Amino acid sequence: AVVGIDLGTTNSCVAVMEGKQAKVLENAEGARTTPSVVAFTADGERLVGMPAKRQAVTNPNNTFYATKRLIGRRYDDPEVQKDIKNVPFKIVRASNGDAWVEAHGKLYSPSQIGAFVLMKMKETAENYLGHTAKNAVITVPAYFNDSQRQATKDAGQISGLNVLRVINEPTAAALAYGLDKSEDKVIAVYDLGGGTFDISILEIQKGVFEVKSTNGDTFLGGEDFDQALLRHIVKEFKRETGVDLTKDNMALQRVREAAEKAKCELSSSVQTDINLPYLTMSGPKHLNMKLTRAQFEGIVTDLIRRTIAPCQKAMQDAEVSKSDIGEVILVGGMTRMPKVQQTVQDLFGRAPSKAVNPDEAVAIGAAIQGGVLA
Ligand code: NA
Numbered sequence: 001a002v003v004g005i006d007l008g009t010t011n012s013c014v015a016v017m018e019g020k021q022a023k024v025l026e027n028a029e030g031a032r033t034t035p036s037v038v039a040f041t042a043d044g045e046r047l048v049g050m051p052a053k054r055q056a057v058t059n060p061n062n063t064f065y066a067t068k069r070l071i072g073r074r075y076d077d078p079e080v081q082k083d084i085k086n087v088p089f090k091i092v093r094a095s096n097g098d099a100w101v102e103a104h105g106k107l108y109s110p111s112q113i114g115a116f117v118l119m120k121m122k123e124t125a126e127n128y129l130g131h132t133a134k135n136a137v138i139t140v141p142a143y144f145n146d147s148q149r150q151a152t153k154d155a156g157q158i159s160g161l162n163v164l165r166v167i168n169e170p171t172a173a174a175l176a177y178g179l180d181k182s183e184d185k186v187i188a189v190y191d192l193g194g195g196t197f198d199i200s201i202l203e204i205q206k207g208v209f210e211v212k213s214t215n216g217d218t219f220l221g222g223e224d225f226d227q228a229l230l231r232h233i234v235k236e237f238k239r240e241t242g243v244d245l246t247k248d249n250m251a252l253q254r255v256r257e258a259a260e261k262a263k264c265e266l267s268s269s270v271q272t273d274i275n276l277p278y279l280t281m282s283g284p285k286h287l288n289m290k291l292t293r294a295q296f297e298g299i300v301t302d303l304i305r306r307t308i309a310p311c312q313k314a315m316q317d318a319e320v321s322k323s324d325i326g327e328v329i330l331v332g333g334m335t336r337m338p339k340v341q342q343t344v345q346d347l348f349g350r351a352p353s354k355a356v357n358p359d360e361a362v363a364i365g366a367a368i369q370g371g372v373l374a
Pocket of ligand 1: 007008009010196
């Protein structure tokens, strides 16, 4: 049996083929997804996934996230010098000139961190299988190069996986939607993840996939919505109580967790409550706040627009037109947001397909591909 792994910028998922259907596997915490976050506590203990995530704000200098932005990359790559500006942790150039990460004097390569994430996936998958997992199919962005694909392939080996193949994410998702046997059909893939946004235009002819165009934004994702919502919450609190939280990470850690929760609520509801008791201390100050969908949409209107232009360029570079696109599938949890769904519809001129879970589709596709190989 061959494991399929979506090693994501922000979140990872693992699925395997059970019969004629792919089964997504859930970790020891009962979650079907795992944060691609790795951190080292002051003492030197290592944390991976949710544990690291729940410390990300209080321990910024030693928490590694969005490493996938650095994997397979040279240090002087504009994409790395840009990332340095947007992340608090330290990036240093290895002896190769490759982009590395440093924490507490110990430095790691992006492939090592990925390996830490892949190790837990491996663990997660093995619980299911019973035996040990040896063979994997891991996914990479269409825009990845050899250097990036090898480094991803190398990360799998460190964790003890033989990466039989590396397939493109957009292609993987298309597999999850059954487009494998399409005679002729042009597909647009709108992937808005926790950390990156991707638009990829695919054509399938007699079952052969071609990536015609690819565009997007490396620094626009779901986390950016959370932060914009956090600033709004923080700013609204100063007004009402006069307390400024910016300097208290322990509280900011809670707000982020709370901002992450409100966002999810507002894709199924138009209102939710931000309730954070004893956030600070003339006495305790409790954070009680009401957030509505229309408000949220307003707060992150600019995050959404920024998707509109890359998708237009994608079709241009692919010499296509809304009429030409036969289907549009959504990938990324941030695609659950209705306003994202609407912006996606009046962009490609059709209702987006939402049959497959937005953030398990790639893992599922990776499974399909792996079942084929076994
Ligand atoms: Na990703």
